[PDB]
Design a protein around this ligand. Structure first.
Ligand SMILES: Nc1ncnc2c1ncn2[C@@H]1O[C@H](COP(=O)(O)OP(=O)(O)OP(=O)(O)O)[C@@H](O)[C@H]1O
Ligand SMILES: [Mg+2]
Lengths: 514, 463, 48, 464, 73
C-alpha cells in the first residue's frame, strides 16, 4: 500500500466524478499541486515534453524534468515563493533556448540570455537549443593549432591546443581563477572569442572579475555568464550548457572560441540537490546515477571540426576554414584528494590536467604548477615551432632538479656534477615564477628559455634571476623590436633567428645590467 | 479563513486550511491558544501546509485552531532597537519594557542584484598590529575567526567593537546563533560597563530552543543591520554597519536537524541537500553596495578540527579573510594570539594595499616560516653551531613574535587602560626598520606589550 | 663513515616497508568509509 | 497488439504500458513510432507495465506516445561486410560511408558456450613480439590485461598485434571501444587507415557522451561480431581465430554501476551494483576456445586509486590469464615495445604447458634481470670497481638482454624505413640460451639493438 | 569422484545452491556407514552470490554489505 499520489486530491477527484471529458483540459494546461524548495508539481500537462519550457501565470518559467504517471515535476528558473497551489501552468511546445550571435560580446547575461549589466536589451538575430549533441567522430580533426596562456611553465611544459580540453585542478585559493583569467587576457591578438562562465560565486567577485576584464580591454571579445551563489539551483545547473551553446556558435562557422567553466564542482552540487529533491535514487556521496553523463556530454562538445563539417553546416558560405572550441574546466579538491567522485569523473574525460599545489603556493612559488604530475596528452603538436624546439631543456632541467632536490639542504659535500645540476635546476625553478595580468608573448618565452638553456644565467645569483629576466625582456622589446615582431607573427626558428637572439643576449650582458 | 493542526511530530507541525485560502511560503501563523508562532515551509496539496515552530512545541493538541497573518515574520527596526536584547520574533527579553517603534521589515528578502555592487574595494583598518598587517580586512567583507581553545575570542570581539565605535560612529549588531548563555551574558555586561551599549543591538537564540529560533536569529540580525545601513542621514549617504554572528556553524546544523523531517533525502555526510543554498541565501546579503556597507565578523567552529567536511568547506567560498587563533601563541604570553603563519587573507595584494605593505608582509612571513623550520636543529644542537646567517633570522623572528603583542584597552586591569590603536603607517615603518636591522641591537624584552616604535625605543632606553 | 652509510641504507629499506604496510591499511579504511556512507544514505532515503 | 504507449519518463528511464496479454520478453528492443530511438527492456513490473532504458537522448519524447516492439533482442549486422567500418551499439554506420552491405543479423544476448563445447587443449598463441612470446606468452581463448597509460604506445601495440594475427594465423579482429573519447577515436581511426591494417578490423565505438545504456552494450555488440567471425567455417571446417580488443574494461564496470543506480537497486559494498560479478561473468565467459575456433581478448585495465583490492580489479583479475605492464622509464630509454620484462606475468608460464627448456630459460632471464636491478644501486653509490667479476658479467649480459628485447614493428615501416621483423619461437629461445651461457660475450651491446633473431645480431656485429 | 559445476555465467541461484547439492550427494555414503570427502571450491563466491540474491530482495546489509545471516549460510 503506497502513499497518496499528487493526483489524489479531493477537488480533482470530485471533478473526475463529474466527468472525464475534455481530455484532461485540452492536454496543454496544468494546475499546481505542490510547492517546496524550488520544485513545483503540476497535475495535467499531457503534451509535456521532457525538457520543455513551461510558463506560469506570474510570468516565470519552468522546465519539466520528471514526467511521471499522473503528475509532472518541474524546476523553477526564476524564484519561487510567488507560486501557490491552484495556479495554472502552460506548455509552450518548445525546448530551452538562448540567444546567440556576435551581439553578446561585452555583455553579462543570465543562464537564459537575459542582460543583467543594465546596458539595455540584447538585439540577437538567432536562438539555439540549450541541449545539443556533439559532432560525430568522423567529422573531427586532429589538434595542431596552439592556444597561448601567457605562462612560461604552461606554454612550455603543458601545452594547450585548439580543440583540447585541459583541466585546472587544485585546492582552494591556489590560483585557478587567476590562471583562467590570464588565459582569457592573453588572447588580445589571437582573434579567438572567449566565454567565461561563473557558477555559484559571490557577485562581488564576479563584479571584480568583470571590472578587471574591462580594464585590460579583454571585454571586446568576451561574454560572461553569471549564475551566482544566491541564484536558484536550476540556473547554476543550466549555466554551463547555455555558455557552451554561445561558444559553439563560433565553432560551427569557421572561427575559433575558448570557454572556461568555473567550479564544475558547484554544478555537480546543484544537480545533486535538484535530483534529490525530485526523489531520484542516489549513489556514492548521494550523487545521482548519471553525474558522469552530466559532465561528459557537456565536455565532449568542445572539439575541432573538419572543413567539410563547417562547409556543410553553413551551406557553402565559409568553405575554407575549420572551427574549434577549447574548454578549461575548473575543479576544487578537499586537501588534495583527487580520488573523490566528481574529480575522478572529470579527470577521465579531459585530455590533461594542470595540478596546483597548496604547498608550492605557500612557499612563494606562484603559479604553483606541479610539473611532476601535470600532463597534456596532445603533446608537441600543440606548440609553435620555436617553443616546441626549446622546451626540451626546460623539461629535462625540471626533471633532474626534481630527482635530486633532497641534496639542496646539505650543500656541503656535493660533487662537481650534481652541484651543477642543482645550480641549473634552482635557476630554472626561479625562472618560472610570474606575476598576475602580465602575460608573455611567445617571443618573450622563447628569449627567456633560450637564455636559460645556453647557460647565460649560470653566472647570476639565484635571488636576482627574476630581475635579470625582466630586464632582458625589456631590453629586447626596446632595441630589437623587428625581431620580436617577426617571432610573434611567424614563430619560425632558424639559424638566423638563433644567431640574432644570441647576439642580443651577449650584447645585453656587456651593456647595462639588471 | 482559519485552519486546524492535524499532525505534530517533533518540531514539524501540519495545518489544514480551506482550499481557497492557503498561506504562501514563509508566511507567519499564530496559534490561537498560545504564544507559539509557526512559519510555512512547503505546500502539500489539499490546503495542507507543513511548518516549524518558533518556541514551545509542548502542550499543543491536534485540531487546535490556527489563524494566519498573510506576511512573513516582521521584526522591529529603527533607532529604538539600540541597546536592547531581542529574541527571533523581536520581543524584548531584557525586561526593560516594550520596544518603542513602529517600523518593521520582513526577515526574508532577496539578495542585492549584480548592478548595485560596490564600484571598489576599500580597506578597513582596526589598529591591532597583527590583523592590519598580515590579515587586512575589507570594507563590507566577511571575516572568520577559526579555531582557538578556551581563550579571549570574546575579548577580541569586544575589543573590535570598541575600536570600530571609538574610531567610527557606525552602529553594530550582535546575533548569537546558538551561543552559550554564559558567554552572551558576559558580553552583555561588558558592553554595559564600557558604555558601548548605546550602539549595539542584540538577538539571541540560546542553544536550547527549537531549531526555528537558531535558524532565524541570523536573519533577524541581518535585517536589523540592513535597515541600519539603508538609512541615509543628512546628506544622502548610508552608514557603515558591523554585524557579528557568534557561531555560524550552528546555523547549518539548525537546518540539518529539520531537514530530515521535512521530507528530504540526506547528502554526503548527512547534511541537507540545500546546504549551499541556505549558506548562499544568508551570506549574499552581507556586501558593500552603492549606498552604505555591511561588514561582518563570524566565529566559525570546525568539528573535530577537520575542515574538509562540507560545513566549513562551504563557508570558505565566502570568506575574505581567516584569522586563526592558537593555543600555544596565547600560552607563550602573546595576548591577541593570532597565528601569523596560518591566518591569511584575500586582501593581501599589492594592487589594493600598495607595494611596500605587501613586500613587508612577505618578508615577515618568510622570516617566521624559516625560523619555525629551524626549531628541531636549535633544540638538538643549540644556537652556537648555526651559521652566522640564520642566527639573525632567529633573533629577528623572536623580536617579530614579541612585537605582535598588544595591550587591550577594554581590559583596564593588569594593563593600565592602554588603548593604542596604532596607525598602519607606524606599523609599516616599524617592521621595515626591524627587518632592515636598524633595531637589531635592542633587547627582545623591549618589543613586548607596546604599540608603536616610539614606545619600544622609550622602554629600551629606560632599561 | 662506512657504518653510517650502511645504517642509512637499512633505514631507507625499513621506511620503504612501512610505506607498503600503511598503504594497505589506508585502502582498507577507504573502502570501509565508502561502504558506511552508502549504507547511511540508502537507509535515510528508504526511511523517508 | 504489440503496440503500446509511453506512460512515464524520468531522465533516461522510460516506462511503457502494453495490454496484459502482449507484454514482451526481457531484453527485447522496442522502437518508438515516429522517431528513431531504441528502448531495451530491463524488468517487467506487472499489470502490463515495462521499465526500459533508452539508447540515446530522451529530450522531445512525451507521454502517450505509441511504441512498437520487435520481439527480439538488439540485432547487429555481421559478416565480412563489417570489416573496415565504424558502428555504434545498434549496428549502424557512423563513418559516413553508406549502409552496411550485409544481410545477416544476430542477437547480442545469447548463452555462453556450454561445458561440452570447451576445447580439448589450451596450447599457445605464437606471435613474434619476442617479449610476449618468452616472458608472458598468450593462450588461445585467453584474456590478457594490458596495464599502462597513454604515452607509451598502447595503440602501436594494438596495431602490431592486429597486423601479426592477420598475417600469421589468417585471423580477423574486432575493436570495441567502451567509453571512447571522440578525439582519440578519430585519431586511432586515421592512424589505422593510413597504415593498411584497417582492412582487417571491424570497429565498434560507444563514445562517452552517450547514455550509460550504450556504453554497457557496445562490448556485447563487439563480442557478437567476434563470435560470428569465429563460428563461420571454410572447407574442412576449422573456423578462424579472432582477437577482440576491449579498452578500459573499468569503463564497462562503471557503465554497469550507472544503469543499476538508475533502475534503483540497493548498492553493494563499495557502491558497485549487486550484480557486479555476474555482469563481468556474462562478458568474460563468452571469450573462450571451442572446437571450431577461439577468441582472444586484449583488454586495457585501469586500477582506481591505485588500489588493486577493491571490487572492480579484484573481480577482473579472476578471469585474466596474462598481464602485460608497460613502463614509462623503459620507453624513456628508447626501448620499444616498452613492455616491462620484470613485472609482466603470465599464468601460461608453467613447465607443464610451455615445455621444460622454455620455462628454465625464462626464469634464468628474469633472475639475471633481478640481480642487475639489485646491482645498479651499488654501481651508483660505491663505484663500478667495487663489484666482483661475476657481477661484471651479470651487468654486461643484463644490458645485452635489455637491448635484445627490442625489435622494429611493421607499422613503424611507414614512419621509419626499417621493415618490421616477426621472429618466431625456437629462435628467441636459441638466442637467449646462447646469451645466458656466455657464448656471445664478445659482441658489443649496440649489436643487440632493434633487430630480430640472433643471426641478424651476428651480421650486425660483423658490420660493426 | 563426482563433480558439481556452477560456472561464472550460471544464475546466482545455482551458485547459491551448488554446495548444498554436493553435500546431499556426499551424505549418501555417510548415512550408510561409508566414508566420503567433499571439497567446496571458493565459498567466498557462494557468499557473493547470496549477497546478490539478498540485496535484490531489498534486505538491509551488515558489514561489507553482506546480509545479516551470512554466518548461518
Ligand atoms: N600567479 C599569481 N601571482 C601572484 N598572485 C597571485 C597569483 N595567483 C593568485 N594570486 C593571488 O593570490 C590569490 C589567488 O588567486 P585566485 O583568485 O585565482 O585563487 P582561487 O584558487 O581561484 O580561489 P577560490 O577557488 O577559493 O575562489 C588571489 O588573492 C590573487 O590575488
Ligand atoms: Mg576562484
Amino acid at each position: 500500500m503506497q502513499q497518496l499520489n499528487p493526483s489524489e486530491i479531493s477537488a480533482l477527484i470530485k471533478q473526475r466524478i463529474g466527468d472525464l471529458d475534455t481530455s484532461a483540459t485540452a492536454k496543454n494546461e496544468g494546475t499546481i499541486v505542490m510547492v517546496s524548495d524550488g520544485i513545483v508539481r503540476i497535475h495535467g500537462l499531457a503534451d509535456a515534453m521532457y525538457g520543455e519550457m513551461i510558463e506560469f501565470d506570474g510570468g516565470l518559467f519552468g522546465m519539466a524534468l520528471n514526467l511521471e504517471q499522473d503528475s509532472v515535476g518541474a524546476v523553477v528558473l526564476g524564484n519561487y515563493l510567488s507560486l501557490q497551489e491552484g495556479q495554472k501552468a502552460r506548455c509552450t511546445g518548445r525546448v530551452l533556448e538562448v540567444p546567440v550571435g556576435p551581439e553578446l560580446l561585452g555583455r553579462v547575461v543570465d543562464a537564459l540570455g537575459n542582460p543583467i549589466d543594465g546596458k539595455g536589451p540584447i538585439d540577437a538575430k538567432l536562438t539555439d537549443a540549450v541541449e545539443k549533441v556533439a559532432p560525430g567522430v568522423i567529422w573531427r580533426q586532429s589538434v595542431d593549432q596552439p592556444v597561448q596562456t601567457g605562462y612560461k611553465s604552461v606554454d612550455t611544459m603543458i601545452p594547450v591546443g585548439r580543440g583540447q580540453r585541459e583541466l585546472i585542478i587544485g585546492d582552494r585559493q591556489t590560483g585557478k581563477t587567476a590562471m583562467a583569467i590570464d588565459a582569457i587576457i592573453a588572447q588580445k591578438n589571437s582573434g579567438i572569442k572567449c566565454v567565461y562562465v561563473a557558477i555559484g560565486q559571490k557577485q562581488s567577485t564576479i563584479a571584480n572579475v568583470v571590472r578587471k576584464l574591462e580594464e585590460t580591454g579583454a571585454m571586446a571579445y568576451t561574454t560572461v555568464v553569471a549564475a551566482a551563489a544566491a541564484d536558484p539551483a536550476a540556473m547554476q545547473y543550466l549555466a554551463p550548457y547555455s555558455g557552451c551553446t554561445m561558444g559553439e556558435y563560433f565553432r560551427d562557422r569557421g572561427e575559433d572560441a575558448l570557454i572556461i567553466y568555473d567550479d564544475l564542482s558547484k554544478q555537480a552540487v546543484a544537480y545533486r540537490q535538484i535530483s534529490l529533491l525530485l526523489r531520484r535514487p542516489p549513489g556514492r556521496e548521494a550523487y545521482p546515477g548519471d553525474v558522469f553523463y552530466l559532465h561528459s556530454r557537456l565536455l565532449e562538445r568542445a572539439s575541432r571540426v573538419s572543413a567539410e563539417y563547417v562547409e556543410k553546416f553553413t551551406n557553402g558560405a565559409v568553405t575554407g576554414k575549420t572551427g574549434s572550441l577549447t574548454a578549461l574546466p575548473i575543479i576544487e579538491t578537499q586537501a588534495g584528494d583527487v580520488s573523490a567522485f566528481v574529480p575522478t569523473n572529470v579527470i577521465s574525460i579531459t585530455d590533461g590536467q594542470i595540478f596546483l599545489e597548496t604547498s608550492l603556493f605557500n612557499a612563494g612559488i606562484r603559479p604553483a604548477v606541479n610539473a611532476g604530475i601535470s600532463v597534456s596528452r596532445v603533446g608537441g603538436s600543440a606548440q609553435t615551432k620555436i617553443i616546441k624546439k626549446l622546451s626540451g631543456g626546460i623539461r629535462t632541467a625540471l626533471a633532474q632538479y626534481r630527482e635530486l632536490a633532497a641534496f639542496a639542504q646539505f650543500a656541503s659535500d656535493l660533487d662537481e656534477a650534481t652541484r651543477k645540476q642543482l645550480e641549473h635546476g634552482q635557476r630554472v625553478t626561479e625562472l618560472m615564477k610570474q606575476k598576475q595580468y602580465a602575460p608573455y608573448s611567445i617571443a618573450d618565452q622563447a628569449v627567456s628559455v633560450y637564455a636559460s638553456n645556453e647557460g647565460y644565467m649560470a653566472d647570476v645569483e639565484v635571488k636576482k634571476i627574476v630581475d635579470f629576466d625582466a630586464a632582458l625582456i625589456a631590453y629586447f622589446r626596446s632595441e630589437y623590436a623587428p625581431l620580436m615582431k617577426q617571432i610573434d607573427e611567424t614563430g619560425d626558428y632558424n639559424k638566423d633567428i638563433e644567431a640574432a637572439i644570441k647576439a642580443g643576449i651577449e650584447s645585453f650582458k656587456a651593456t647595462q645590467t639588471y | 479563513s482559519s485552519g486546524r493542526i492535524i499532525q505534530i511530530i517533533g518540531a514539524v507541525i501540519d495545518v489544514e486550511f480551506e482550499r481557497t485560502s492557503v498561506p504562501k511560503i514563509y508566511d507567519a501563523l499564530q496559534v490561537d491558544g498560545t504564544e507559539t508562532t509557526l512559519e510555512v515551509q512547503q505546500q502539500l496539496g489539499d490546503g495542507v501546509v507543513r511548518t516549524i515552530a518558533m518556541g514551545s512545541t509542548e502542550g499543543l493538541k491536534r485540531g487546535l485552531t490556527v489563524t494566519s497573518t498573510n506576511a512573513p515574520i516582521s521584526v522591529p527596526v529603527g533607532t529604538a532597537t539600540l541597546g536592547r536584547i531581542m529574541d527571533v520574533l523581536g520581543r524584548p527579553i531584557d525586561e526593560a519594557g516594550p520596544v518603542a517603534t513602529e517600523e518593521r521589515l520582513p526577515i526574508h528578502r532577496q539578495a542585492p542584484s549584480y548592478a548595485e555592487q560596490a564600484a571598489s574595494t576599500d580597506l578597513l583598518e582596526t589598529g591591532i598590529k597583527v590583523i592590519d598587517l598580515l590579515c587586512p580586512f575589507a570594507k563590507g567583507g566577511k571575516v572568520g575567526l577559526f579555531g582557538g581553545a578556551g581563550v579571549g575570542k570574546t575579548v577580541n570581539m569586544m575589543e573590535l567593537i570598541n575600536n570600530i565605535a571609538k574610531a567610527h560612529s557606525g552602529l553594530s549588531v550582535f546575533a548569537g546563533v546558538g551561543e552559550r548563555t554564559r558567554e552572551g551574558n558576559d558580553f552583555y555586561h561588558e558592553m554595559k560597563d564600557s558604555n558601548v551599549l548605546d550602539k549595539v543591538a542584540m538577538v539571541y537564540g540560546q542553544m536550547n530552543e527549537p531549531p526555528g529560533n537558531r535558524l532565524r536569529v541570523a536573519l533577524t540580525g541581518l535585517t536589523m543591520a540592513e535597515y541600519f545601513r539603508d538609512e541615509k542621514d543628512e546628506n544622502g549617504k548610508g552608514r557603515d554597519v558591523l554585524l557579528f554572528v557568534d557561531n555560524i556553524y550552528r546555523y547549518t546544523l539548525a537546518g540539518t536537524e529539520v531537514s530530515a523531517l521535512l521530507g528530504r533525502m540526506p547528502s554526503a555526510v548527512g547534511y541537507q541537500p540545500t546546504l549551499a543554498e541556505e549558506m548562499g541565501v544568508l551570506q549574499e546579503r552581507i556586501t558593500s553596495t552603492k549606498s552604505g556597507s555591511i561588514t561582518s565578523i563570524q566565529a566559525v567552529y570546525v568539528p573535530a578540527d577537520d575542515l574538509t567536511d562540507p560545513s566549513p568547506a562551504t563557508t570558505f567560498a565566502h570568506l575574505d579573510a581567516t584569522v586563526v587563533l592558537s593555543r600555544d601563541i596565547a600560552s607563550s604570553g602573546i595576548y591577541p594570539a593570532i597565528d601569523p603563519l596560518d591566518s591569511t587573507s584575500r586582501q593581501l595584494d599589492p594592487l589594493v594595499v600598495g607595494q611596500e605593505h605587501y613586500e613587508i608582509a612577505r618578508a615577515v612571513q618568510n622570516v617566521l616560516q624559516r625560523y619555525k623550520e629551524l626549531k628541531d636543529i636549535i633544540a638538538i644542537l643549540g644556537m652556537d653551531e648555526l651559521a652566522e646567517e640564520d642566527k639573525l633570522v632567529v633573533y629577528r623572528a623572536r623580536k617579530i613574535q614579541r612585537f605582535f603583542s598588544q595591550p587591550f584597552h577594554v581590559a583596564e586591569v593588569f594593563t593600565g587602560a592602554p588603548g593604542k590603536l596604532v596607525p598602519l603607517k607606524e606599523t609599516i615603518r616599524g617592521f621595515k626598520g626591524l627587518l632592515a636591522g636598524e633595531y637589531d641591537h635592542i633587547p627582545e624584552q623591549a618589543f613586548y606589550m607596546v604599540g608603536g616604535i616610539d614606545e619600544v625605543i622609550a622602554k629600551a632606553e629606560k632599561l | 663513515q662506512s657504518a653510517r652509510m650502511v645504517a642509512m641504507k637499512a633505514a631507507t629499506d625499513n621506511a620503504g616497508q612501512l610505506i607498503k604496510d600503511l598503504q594497505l591499511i589506508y585502502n582498507k579504511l577507504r573502502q570501509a568509509a565508502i561502504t558506511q556512507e552508502i549504507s547511511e544514505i540508502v537507509g535515510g532515503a528508504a526511511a523517508v
